[PDB]
Amino acid sequence: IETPITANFREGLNVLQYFISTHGARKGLADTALKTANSGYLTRRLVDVA
Amino acid sequence: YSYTEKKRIRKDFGKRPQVLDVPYLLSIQLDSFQKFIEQDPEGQYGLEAAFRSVFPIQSYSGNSELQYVSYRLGEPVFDVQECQIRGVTYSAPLRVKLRLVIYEREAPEGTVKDIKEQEVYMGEIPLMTDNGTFVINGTERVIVSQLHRSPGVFFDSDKGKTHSSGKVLYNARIIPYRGSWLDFEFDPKDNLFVRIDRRRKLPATIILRALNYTTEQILDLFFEKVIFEIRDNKLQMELVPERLRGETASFDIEANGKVYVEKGRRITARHIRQLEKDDVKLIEVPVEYIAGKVVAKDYIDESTGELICAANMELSLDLLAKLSQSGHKRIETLFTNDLDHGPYISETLRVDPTNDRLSALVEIYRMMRPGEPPTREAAESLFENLFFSEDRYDLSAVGRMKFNRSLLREEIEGSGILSKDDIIDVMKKLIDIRNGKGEVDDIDHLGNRRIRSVGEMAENQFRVGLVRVERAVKERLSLGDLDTLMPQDMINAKPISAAVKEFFGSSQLSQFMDQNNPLSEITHKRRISALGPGGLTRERAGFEVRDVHPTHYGRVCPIETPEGPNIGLINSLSVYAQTNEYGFLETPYRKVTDGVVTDEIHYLSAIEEGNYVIAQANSNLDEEGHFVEDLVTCRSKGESSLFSRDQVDYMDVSTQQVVSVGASLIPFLEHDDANRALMGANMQRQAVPTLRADKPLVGTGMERAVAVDSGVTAVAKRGGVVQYVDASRIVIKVNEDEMYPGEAGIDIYNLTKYTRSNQNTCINQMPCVSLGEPVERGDVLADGPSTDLGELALGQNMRVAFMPWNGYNFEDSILVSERVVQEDRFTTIHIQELACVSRDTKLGPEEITADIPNVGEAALSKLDESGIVYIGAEVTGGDILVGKVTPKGETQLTPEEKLLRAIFGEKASDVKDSSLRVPNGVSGTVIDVQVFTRDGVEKDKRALEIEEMQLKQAKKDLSEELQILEAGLFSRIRAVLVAGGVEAEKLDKLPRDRWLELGLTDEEKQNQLEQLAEQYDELKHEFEKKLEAKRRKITQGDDLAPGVLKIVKVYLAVKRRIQPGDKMAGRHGNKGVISKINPIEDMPYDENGTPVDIVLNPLGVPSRMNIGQILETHLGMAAKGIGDKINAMLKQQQEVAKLREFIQRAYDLGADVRQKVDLSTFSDEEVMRLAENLRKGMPIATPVFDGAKEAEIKELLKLGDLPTSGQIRLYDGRTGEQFERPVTVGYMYMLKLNHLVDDKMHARSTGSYSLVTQQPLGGKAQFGGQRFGEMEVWALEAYGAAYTLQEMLTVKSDDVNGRTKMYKNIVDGNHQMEPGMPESFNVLLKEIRSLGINIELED
Amino acid sequence: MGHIELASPTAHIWFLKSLPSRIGLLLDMPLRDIERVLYFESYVVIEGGMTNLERQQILTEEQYLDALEEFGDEFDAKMGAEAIQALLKSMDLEQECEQLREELNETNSETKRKKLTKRIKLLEAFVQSGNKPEWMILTVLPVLPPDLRPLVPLDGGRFATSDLNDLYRRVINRNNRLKRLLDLAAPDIIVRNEKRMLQEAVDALLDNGRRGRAITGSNKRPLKSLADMIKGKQGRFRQNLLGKRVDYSGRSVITVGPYLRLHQCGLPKKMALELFKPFIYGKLELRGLATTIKAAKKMVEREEAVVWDILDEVIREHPVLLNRAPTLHRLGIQAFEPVLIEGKAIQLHPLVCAAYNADFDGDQMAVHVPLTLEAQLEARALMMSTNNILSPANGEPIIVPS
Amino acid sequence: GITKASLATESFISAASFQETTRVLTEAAVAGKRDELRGLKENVIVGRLIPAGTGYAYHQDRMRRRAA
Amino acid sequence: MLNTCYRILGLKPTVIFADQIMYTGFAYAARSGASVGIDDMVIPEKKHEII
RNA sequence: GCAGUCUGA
DNA sequence: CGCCGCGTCAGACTGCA
DNA sequence: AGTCTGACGCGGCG
């Protein structure tokens, strides 16, 4: 998004800057919740090949 | 203000003026179920529109009919509480008035022979309690709302993810509310295809040929005709000029003069306007222009009759001459110019093998029911009821609305089934989107997704039940019993009461309610679950449906969602969000007119919102309403950018419009990273209610709504004066202008005392009001669990310091002083229900007795003679609660034991000790014993004792309500007498029984006199019978499960104190586990000797940027610094003048705060009550995203004489010397989550084992044994720990001889295994040999 | 084990449908036609004779009854598992592979040589091993022992059934029904339908859902196969054989306890009393404080004050393994010496948290007790936390101040 | 690949316990295979000392007293 | 420092050194009183200009 | 024993 | 076009033959 | 077998 969060966490993020923040926050959380499966499956394949 | 809210006034730091007060939080559940069970005379909603959708029911032949005429919900047999105690459903009987009409076969028009109407009972439908929960089998459930893809038509794509060429394949999909999905899709060959119900695809025009269309009519629909008309020769063709745009011709074009383009040149736009101004009518082109064109018609030779060329055939020179010799001076041709139009239909009209309606129908039958040879009268009957029959396909009213909205039609209502033109227009818009005159739908748009909720899902299940009923009644009506048959004899109520019961009790969305605190209840009642029947699956949902969409602003909270495998699938409806009459989430906005922001609010849906320019809630406004800024930041079309203050069309109605009610209670949310705000919101719902509730010093003002809107609190229904107040009862005397005529005028609120929550916590209502106090309507009378004086209070205010202390706060740990355990700040009560179910066994029945064998009279001390524990008995782990013994057999005593019991002279008895015992580790008090005996079973002595206690309790409560209400009635009658025609001279003498009919002036006063006498007569007469009602409800037998004779349920209260291991948390996601209970004299203390209560790690702040826990800590210090001032003035006994002066100064502090507390309105009594409520700290309101700026926090600190830096110097409690740097000290609101270490600790040396595999069992309920999974076996293989691994495999779990040998060896001081083969491997061999496969060990 | 004598032969679904089909690859016959012959939808000619009735030819029934007169009864064509069994039992391996070895040696387009060497590999594997082809068609069905499909009596006055017990019963009915129709001499259309039902029932028992729509009982949820018992994340191999639940184990929340030394860990007294219970019984009987394992069991469950003095010796040099899942790497299991603490939370040295990836915001750990002397010495010499201060991934310290 | 090279081992117990169990069991049935328990998983299945580490010294005696 | 001790002195001095480091670091972090406050996050006065 | 739901790390 | 896989451990609650 | 069914994944692989 082309207008950044010009505010930091000592000042307040206003409600729009905060809503924007939530996009990347939930992308990170939903990435962690679903890439542990890929990591575990690759680990299991490596163990069973070796 | 209020009367309950000038007891303690939370200082509000909010600056925006509140335009729209927060709606009723539970209105989703309540509105939807009300629409389900309401009488709807228009017949659009609920039970009425489910009945009218089936009825009238006619027989297969038409000799008779069964017609619905009305319905009614009876009274529930058991109230909400009797249902929870007895373990039965809270439901109401559905009585429907059905009228069977027997028609004549002796009349041609179908005259009726006879009418028989009667009220048939079909099913019991579970009623919703006034809190939005359903009491099903005695457990409270919540049917969470579901967010599913709305019916309609959706054009989507796979953006270059097939055929490896990046070619975008566009596909439409028609999704009904029920019925068969209908998909159209392009191929990389640009041929159009159609799937039905996601099975194998056909050429698209097959469906167009299943409809009675010829190829000529199909090319009519999907094309526009260019016409060659050979007048003398050389291709005289009619052309509209703008057709040639983008087309390059190797021939030049002239007509009636000027040539306009050269041969081989591109026709330009200036050339197009040149063709325009020339008013061109016709053009002659070279003759080879025909080759490659396709004839738009089927042509027949008028001279011979022969088929010259079929339609859809591409023309050639020889074919052109063959046409010309036929007299067809005019020929037509599909306009298939590329990159604005397309031949897609012409080619898919070639690849289809079917050329007539019957071929299309039978081919559809082949693809639909494969392996079955088709039949014409069967194929067309399949096709008609695929998409064009009301009983197999319903595009619901939302489906028709979204349909006509997507195809850009004008009428939003119509038939619920598809038509020829509907499918045609879907294909046409799909072809458009292929050409580039459209765009694909966003599937995650909350204008494309829809809230289906309790009253809609229950109506769906009721429709399913009714259609099973009607398919039974249609064939039952064909019988010959017609003239003697009544409608009751043909309605089978088992399908209906099977469907609704299966839904309510076993569905995916009717979830066991989360009852930790009031916040858990509310946020559960407002979940939005994308899962469920008709929705996604938690594994098949991708990354795109999980994340937050720009249309989630104000409709769905972006930060409150579970963190596990269903992140982003379960959402929480935000504060002000609503649903349309269609089910699309809408949110309110203040309409901005000519620059001034009105107070008129409009609820905009996610599609209406896109068209406007919507300002932020943080956009400042002057006294009259203009944007004081000239470039305000706004949201238009999903993006966000600056606009001029006159382009703005709407404005947000509040700053907390965006977040749910869970994340609305996090103070200083605008400073926490959303990862930690998510955890704080999710952890506020697991905090258990402590012993003594404690308000937040720093809150957000949404506490009074969350507490009141859930049902944990007892709010006054009518204003009045507290007439009586007891720990279990509040009797309010209603005001004179609030009581209806003919009424006692007294409201009795019976408080719930110490009942078991769903999570085994304690829910307990304490009276908030005291005697004689006046209360208003809507004032809290009794605080629930986790509410303090009306506000939601989930945890306690602990004095935290942020500093590392000797490693005891290492890596998210928490170090608690011993004074937090001494003061019982975090001690919670948990109530466990243990059941002892006396079974009927084939060897005889088991019996509840206190004569258990194999146990001394020491352990039977707490049991009474009937075998059950005493109420109030403090029992510990292992105590017998209910003595039960079971008849047994097959002892077969072994030889050595045969000698043993003959030596010491007694053989074993015939019964087995099967008594109920307290689990290990739990130690509590028996606070309740409920005995249920099967009807026909002898009641033991304690059952009769409990029954007499219950009967005298019912008689006492009913005589007490009668003696309160009759006292109110006699007080009102005395009031009527003294109000005119004074009789106060003798009312002090007259007995109360004569007041009823004393003669007064009989125009109006004797009217209410006789009316109040009538009301007292009614009260007496109704008590007289309801006493016998609950008498027979107590004495009657119980509808127990089959096989059980009597059930004894024993309730244990366990006061569960805090200890190392218990999880605690703030509200900003700063969880932790207590490490140490430090002595009071080891905790860091300030100059004033005051020891800090909890020591937290500062290194948890800067990494996870939850700064809101520092600012709260600085505000909760300031908010307490004010309290310590008032505590001084109340101990010095300062005048109320000085107290009022200081409290007004504390309430006036702020940078233009929205609230004005003017104390000079408070009587000195009210100021002293306010000061005694504030002496523990002034509660402060920091509303989300407009909260206290930092300068106000420092100003409030400086008011309470504290250092504005927020950090004081501290001394070590142990060494007595000063920490080298100032330490952040302040009051953080800490929660105690339901992750108690008592519930987590487990160990097992040896226990019971599984049945097929002989490995141990799972979980501390079954005495567990921990899974040494695959990764732990690899971890042992990565060491050389082969012997450890062999003992984990053989002798610890699976080996059945190895484990007993190992046990006897461990006992004998010999640590040596004799490992054999695990029993699972032998099980695997047997399972592979039970295939045809001979697996065998080889020696 | 038991056995069901199938009234007719029945094709094993594993050797029919588990791509490539061993029966198809052996008969040089397409699977989409063997599936038709087996399910009684087409005839196939066992022996051709002097006619255009070649061996592997499929001919539909309407193309069969006209052949009833074209060549009389010189040929014999059949359908179902009897036909495929006759084809398998009739063919010769040592001659067929010898016949194929020259067609492979003579073809220059390797596109066919692929199929030829596939079939030659299969035929050489059948002749080298002692198997015979006609064993891919069941005529006897084994029956798993009944304590491995247990019929548990419920305390609710009921019997909770297994899935195999349905899939067996469902077979034993139809088979039995067929054994009647072979004696009632019912018309061949209805014994065709009953042989087809028996085939699909045996296939539903062996592997449910290989033929699409899977049999589901009473839950609208597919029944569990015999082959569903041994495959997947829930089959025996991953669930019971490659990892299994374990006695002498416990679980609790972890807590920092920074007073610890690198080799020891805080273990609650209440857990270390349960895990070490047979060791305590042994030390009680040794020191004369008891005379019988039942007397010692009573002394331990009462927790007399001498039991704790026993326990302080029983866990003197006795390591316990601590494990926090997921055990992503080798250092996820480490053996420490127990220091008996009084709480309920396992205390864990701060330095090993990085190696465990553990942080004290609510994590839990499993404790396991090495019983044997070899297992205690393995825990002490290989797995103790003072031996694991370097990472096995790279030679850099894992015990790093944090 | 690691999956194809895992399913192409000489052991059918190491490849049947990994994944694709019906494939591995039917091909090892029609081939008449023989799993000689030379890996780590084969000895974990059957309850033996793995040939790694402190079981290695065992697994060599088992070879130098049965191959003679 | 710990890796150097392991390479030069071996396992036993390192296992003692790690515990001594842990004890003294915890002790002097406690003596430190190192605490985070709202004034520690010093916003540069050029920010409101730079933006 | 299983399925569903929720939760924790 | 059909088949095969898609992390680990754990606690709780229902309903089911 | 009639559903007043469900579908509503994905990515390799053969």
Ligand SMILES: [Mg+2]
């Ligand atoms: Mg953790």
